[PDB]
Design an enzyme around this catalytic site. Structure first.
Site, mmCIF file in Angstrom:
data_model
loop_
_atom_site.group_PDB
_atom_site.id
_atom_site.type_symbol
_atom_site.label_atom_id
_atom_site.label_comp_id
_atom_site.label_asym_id
_atom_site.label_seq_id
_atom_site.Cartn_x
_atom_site.Cartn_y
_atom_site.Cartn_z
ATOM 1 N N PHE C 22 0.822 -1.028 0.123
ATOM 2 C CA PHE C 22 0.015 0.013 0.091
ATOM 3 C C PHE C 22 0.730 1.293 -0.076
ATOM 4 N N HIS C 88 -8.663 2.260 10.490
ATOM 5 C CA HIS C 88 -7.433 1.499 10.237
ATOM 6 C C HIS C 88 -6.110 2.027 10.893
ATOM 7 N N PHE C 113 11.305 -1.987 13.959
ATOM 8 C CA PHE C 113 9.959 -1.161 13.231
ATOM 9 C C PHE C 113 10.480 -0.381 12.371
#
Lengths: 161, 161, 161, 161, 161, 161
Positions: C22, C88, C113
């Site tokens: 995405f 989301h 991360f």
């Protein structure tokens, strides 16, 4: 209909007690609050077990030890949290809250939340007083009712065998 | 009644220390205070295990190894979170609280929380002088007491054995 | 004293990289930076393991697999979350934060991360060119240090044996 | 360079305690304050010795008895003086102040000034509280540090022989 | 723990009383109150030693002899200082405090301080009625307790012997 | 010291209950609460003796018989006096206090005072819900404790015999 509940007779039960010694100005009061309701509801005290720690933070890890011994039927949370620091009151209160909860579902052993979460020192003066709303008095009793209950559950299982 | 609490002698104990090097100007201040109180309360400084990592995030995964050593009795959490990145302060700090929580509950081994939550750096520097709010001073002391406590818990089990 | 840390060499090491697709405008830019730090900081690219997935949701389930293979030493979590749909970004981003967290703590394997939380494509372009701010670059660095650190933990464990 | 200081381990020491029972509203708190820091710093209590007297006036003559016994290493002053009468607060406070001092130089034995000289009853409520500034806690610790110190002085004398 | 305190029985004890005859209108009031409480708490009044002197100054030198008797267990300081001559009240009263102090510390024998410091004579007369602020009443009682205390101190030494 | 107090187990005990049917709409509320706490604290409900009378006046003469049974260990006074007739509330209520008092003192057998003195009926209904001001709940509990206490008093006499 099959019903289970509990009398309040503390005869035959051996209890767990964890106490924070932060703000002991109220902790002594509650600690005695629980011991009282125990023995004045028939239970002997040579079977009570008391463990003391620094602060609210450590109560989880201790109860986890206490609940794992064979000879402890129920465990009593004990602490007072005064809004000293919002990182420590929001996080440590909810973390111990859920933390104790997951201990119980996990060790299959009843834990009472004997905490006095006071937003102010005045609410701390109200709940350790005379009206016999001595949070230790109460959470001790919830533990006895739950102690005789799971003794009622597991007894109505083991003896029917 | 059977009561357990810990004295603060650091003799015969081997400790864990995990350190973030995010904001090192005060972090050095802390570990000093830590090892100070450890060694002064009689414990030798060669049994210290000191581990260095980047920022606050890895604090968990380090300790998780430190505890799984048979020969580390307790571990001292040490790091500083200053509001630099607020998504990083809510999620990383709380995840530090929970992650350390659940490791300690899981391994049944205590981990203290030498965590200084400062908004401003001046409130940090003010609290490491001689009044010993040197949060490491205290997180060290809590770790000692809990150390002797679980060595008090499980050893009153294995020697009575 | 005994101190453990990790240098910045990627030699002898096998990494994991997990990639969402995405907003792939920015993902191309960050995985590029990530693979820049590995191969430039001593690693060969022959053991860089690159797994791609749809959107930010499936990131966890993948890395958990990359971490269960013996020969992946560290996994570089990489994806972009942009404030599209408040359902989301709040729940899914914290589920990534937490989901990755409990992965590494369970599996005892460093996962870093690299998730850029940005609000505009222009904030992505700024970081893509030459501003030495490719956040995947940094996540690749942190994971290198953790890899060689855990190689320093685990290897000082097995060699002294 | 020859340096002497003291660890804080109360192992092997036998202590002296003198307490006024004037305004016992605070004295009980401090008395326990000292006993705590003693045993929670490793010292046993069968070797502690407590003597109680009427008022601040008599503390001198008692400590003089306690310090002269062979088996008391350090003595803890304990009293609270509230500005009740200026003849009695100015004269009795400075007279015991110097009086204890001259005892120590004379018997060569460390005396801590465990007095809370409060000009008001409010300052009396501040210092027997929760912040772990329980004057008894503190002067007890000064005594242990001085106990291990003069045990460090006289030991580095007697054993080197 | 080994604790020592005194009961107030005056049986088997031989007391000292020193009296200034400066301001005798209330001094007689005092010694009455003194010997009263002595004899009522069971002790015989023939073992009282009562010595009379002029003004407050000689109070010391008298007691110093009284104590060096083997058979006077404690001595009761009794005198009144009313602001008559302020150079005589600062120097004589404080010198009474110190001089008596150091005699007691020196001989290791207690001397109470039956000293009424009145500015006005009415505050004297008001305090000898039935509320027993009859300062002699109390200085007598302190002397009893200390008497039994040193007979408790040194006798727990010589009979355990 | 020899101390006596009672636990609250209702096992092995046979109780007395006297009930006025003046104002029965809340009286039923009370005896429910009474027998509730009796039976829950483990005692069987067939040993209850329950006696019904008209108005508050006969409350005494009923209990006086109930106590002279060898096999009623304690009796629970139960009635409601609402200001209906004020000559009847001063004389009957106080005469209930004294009359019950002197019967208990006379027979040396305890009688609790389940007496709700309400001016308004709403203050009654509010206090029988789950906070257990259900005055019968408590008067029942007092009777248990006193029951076990005199069975604690006279039985520490007849078994030591």
């Amino acid at each position: 209909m099959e019903i289970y509940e509990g009398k309040l007779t503390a005869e035959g039960l051996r209890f767990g007690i964890v106490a924070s010694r932060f703000n002991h100005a109220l902790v002594g009061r509650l600690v005695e609050g629980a011991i009282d309701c125990i023995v004045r509801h028939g239970g002997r005290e040579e079977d009570i077990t008391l463990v003391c720690v620094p602060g609210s933070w450590e109560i989880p890890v201790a109860a986890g030890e206490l609940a794992r011994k064979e000879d402890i039927d129920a465990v009593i949370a004990i602490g007072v949290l005064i809004e000293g620091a919002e990182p420590h009151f929001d996080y440590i209160a909810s973390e111990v809250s859920k933390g104790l909860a997951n201990l119980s579902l996990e060790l299959r052993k009843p834990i009472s939340f004997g905490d006095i979460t006071d937003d102010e020192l005045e609410e701390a003066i109200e709940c350790a007083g005379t009206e016999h709303g001595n949070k230790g008095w109460e959470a001790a009793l919830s533990a006895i009712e739950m102690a005789n209950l799971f003794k009622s559950l597991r007894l109505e299982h083991h003896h029917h065998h």
